[PDB]
Design a binder for this molecule. Structure first.
Ligand SMILES: O=C(COP(=O)(O)O)[C@H](O)[C@H](O)COP(=O)(O)O
Ligand SMILES: O=C(COP(=O)(O)O)[C@H](O)[C@H](O)COP(=O)(O)O
Ligand SMILES: [Mg+2]
Ligand SMILES: [Mg+2]
Lengths: 458, 459
């Protein structure tokens, strides 16, 4: 059974890329107990391409041309790469452009539950030039945010943010005054994933009061501020009535708002509403239950790599990354390339080198309780400091709390940009130097015998 | 974080159910090793509700009466059951309605990655009368489809259909041509999931031709044909534009066009577009890729039960429920269980009972095929026959060609309905008689002694 039509292991991998007619894919799939690797590969190509359940030829002439082909396999590492003709893709009748829906439908649809396949995790795709340019892409990225913070649009550095504690629980005013309280030291305020229009903290009235406390905090600080308004809806016209609300209530302050969409749990149409309708605004892609299917444990679906890479194409200005709250204490691996794939114009994915031809970076939105002492070092490995940061541990960790934690963090960046070594810079700006007094065991190994040098104990 | 405050192991479940201010959720959650069960559940209860990472506040002190509780655990069986107050769920600034997206961020959220939990899968949800009442609901079902086939709205029966095969290839006349010819047996066609505008076979023509083909078949048969057209796009305005091209091209027989949206690979806003812009047509929700969560090789997400229950609330006209397709010792994501939650105004799930308060229903959309002879035994374990059968002409494997298959299997349901044992029907209806010849494998064993009484000679 199943074929020898959907396999051609002689096709050169590079000759394919260069030709530019196919989208390639790279999965780790182990067939259920008993089945052939090849037969299982071609089945899966078959269930993602053309079908024709059992038997014969049917009308024929071209079905047998636009056939997805398996061009390479490793049974031992469990490596299937499948090459999908570009004609199979589905473009709008509206404006002729690609749609992630289809890319997903084909490459990880009825594939994820099908026949002789027992787990299949897509680990990387390659898009040709005739298909890459049908894609939307980010409209904006941290440059329009640097641009609002009066920084230089090329290498502007780090935006310091927070998520207001608590998550849910704050009435409008207190909410609005806990927004005040951090704009006074940091530049960005988020809105946790769920906040919108609860009965006990309505959207209309909270967003009026935040807009306000934006103006007072701008005023006392001289410095511009940035807010992310969660406009996640099911109905795509509430999504619009939220965003149009929020942006016209911010008035003149409208450029300072970033639109939050949790595009994992509402779908590529919440996100394609945000973008397409508000292309000017920063489309913050908060994730969520990305772990249903992207966790290392789940052996089916796709990896985080693939979640972020698709995002660039959809058109997300920024997307969460870095996963801390534990996460290191044994050596880890290979989702480092998330970074250069999101921002560089030509990079090496895990199987394929991608080329985005002038298609805008989407920025790493970083998270965790990484405090200003850990940071100097993270900006070195990555190499630049061009990411939005959202904290909890570094802000709330500092002993003088909120405004100071935030101040210690913009202070750990300057030291890095300006080439001056943290320990020294500690000496001058209290906030930074009290960052070391804040997180002790983090102090004594990053910056050994800091004590003597900072002005205290030995 | 904590334990305390986020635990009230003493809150009786039915007290929680009787009042109705809380959404109840059931999960199969196992802590990573060293971690200590109730503590961890509290820490799950906090990452899905109020947060409260210590000295952070609601200053006046205490506004934790919007705090999600742990009301039950069974450490061995890994059962974490949680209570979500209702004020937490996001409503809408324009109409008042709740949203599956909110529902979905408060439960199906950031617990799906949390570092001190190895997995957690939702098994069921209770969704009360004040929250359930804010929520789309199906605005039509199998009964709008039945009313155009020319049948009664109540206890009204089986709609049979196919999937055009091959799934992709065929430039436009061939795909039209393949529709018409199936439209001489069967009722309903749907394009496969990857179909819209492939350059080789484009929506604009490919749909005009389909509509042309529709009227050829409804001349020559006297009876009505249904089409389920795939109008799935990333952009709502595209979703709508495709969608209004189809109902205007099909025009005079625009009420026979079901609307297909791929529901997993495009989320809720894709579903919500059709649901509200085309309230008037079948919203077919075809669940592609669900497998990544639901398929039981996966321990994180929701199950097929949960995926179909909330798709009801949202507004699918009919969803591809599955197939009975089993053997021996049941449970482990039942076709009956689900079916019963999607149709029945007051069903029971694996933990909770729910009272849909006058919704409407989302028709199970069964797929596989138990040809002619096996069918009425499908209809028995169910207890009705009001679904749609989409089959791979496996179900329509017939000496006479798949024209007699769709009629053979249509015949088996008329038979069941009216209720005169399949066999006495086969003398009377040929494709049924011949439906036996095609299937000696069942049509002997599954339908008793037919040789003597029916269809001819041979051994
Ligand atoms: O709840 C938080 C808090 O921690 P923090 O203080 O770092 O904001 C965040 O919303 C996500 O957990 C992290 O986002 P990501 O999806 O990028 O991991
Ligand atoms: O392409 C097919 C194979 O068809 P068949 O099963 O008839 O051979 C099916 O339509 C869907 O993949 C499953 O749909 P469902 O939600 O009903 O499982
Ligand atoms: Mg959060
Ligand atoms: Mg199908």
């Amino acid at each position: 059974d199943q074929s020898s039509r959907y396999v051609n292991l002689a096709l050169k991998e590079e000759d394919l890329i260069a030709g530019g007619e196919h989208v390639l894919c790279a999965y780790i799939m182990k067939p259920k107990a008993g089945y052939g690797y090849v037969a299982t590969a071609a089945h899966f190509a078959a269930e993602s391409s053309t079908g024709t359940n059992v038997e014969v030829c049917t009308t024929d002439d071209f079905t047998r041309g636009v056939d997805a082909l398996v061009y390479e396999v490793d049974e031992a590492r469990e490596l299937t790469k499948i090459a999908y003709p570009v004609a199979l893709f589905d473009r709008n009748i509206t404006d002729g452009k690609a749609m992630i829906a289809s890319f997903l439908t084909l490459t990880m649809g009825n594939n994820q539950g099908m026949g002789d396949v027992e787990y299949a995790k897509m680990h990387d795709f390659y898009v040709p030039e005739a298909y890459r340019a049908l894609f939307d892409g980010p409209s904006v990225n941290i440059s329009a945010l640097w641009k609002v913070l009066g920084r230089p649009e090329v290498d502007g550095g780090l935006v310091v943010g927070t998520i207001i504690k608590p998550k849910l629980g704050l009435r409008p005013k207190p909410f609005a005054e806990a927004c005040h309280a951090f704009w006074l030291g940091g530049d960005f305020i988020k809105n946790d994933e769920p906040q919108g229009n609860q009965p006990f903290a309505p959207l209309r009235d909270t967003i009026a009061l935040v807009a306000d406390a934006m103006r007072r905090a701008q005023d006392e600080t001289g410095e511009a501020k940035l807010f992310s308004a969660n406009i996640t809806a099911d109905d795509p016209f509430e999504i619009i009535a939220r965003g149009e609300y929020v942006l016209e209530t911010f008035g003149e302050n409208a450029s300072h708002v970033a639109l939050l969409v949790d595009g994992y749990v509402a779908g590529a149409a919440a996100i394609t509403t945000a973008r397409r309708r508000f292309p000017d605004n920063f489309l913050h892609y908060h994730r969520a239950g990305h772990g249903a299917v992207t966790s290392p444990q789940s052996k089916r679906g796709y990896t985080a790599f693939v979640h972020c890479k698709m995002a660039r194409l959809q058109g997300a200005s920024g997307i969460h990354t870095g996963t801390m709250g534990f996460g290191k204490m044994e050596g880890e691996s290979s989702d480092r390339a998330i970074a250069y794939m999101l921002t560089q114009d030509e990079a090496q994915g895990p199987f394929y080198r991608q080329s985005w031809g002038g298609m805008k970076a989407c920025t790493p939105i970083i998270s965790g309780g990484m405090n200003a002492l850990r940071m100097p070092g993270f900006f070195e490995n990555l190499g630049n400091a061009n990411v939005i940061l959202t904290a909890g541990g570094g802000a709330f960790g500092h002993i003088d709390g909120p405004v100071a934690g935030a101040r210690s963090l913009r202070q750990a960046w300057q030291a890095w940009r300006d080439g001056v070594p943290v320990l020294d810079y500690a000496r001058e700006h209290k906030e930074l130097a009290r960052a070391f007094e804040s997180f002790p065991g983090d102090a004594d190994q990053i910056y050994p015998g800091w004590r003597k040098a900072l002005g205290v104990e030995d």
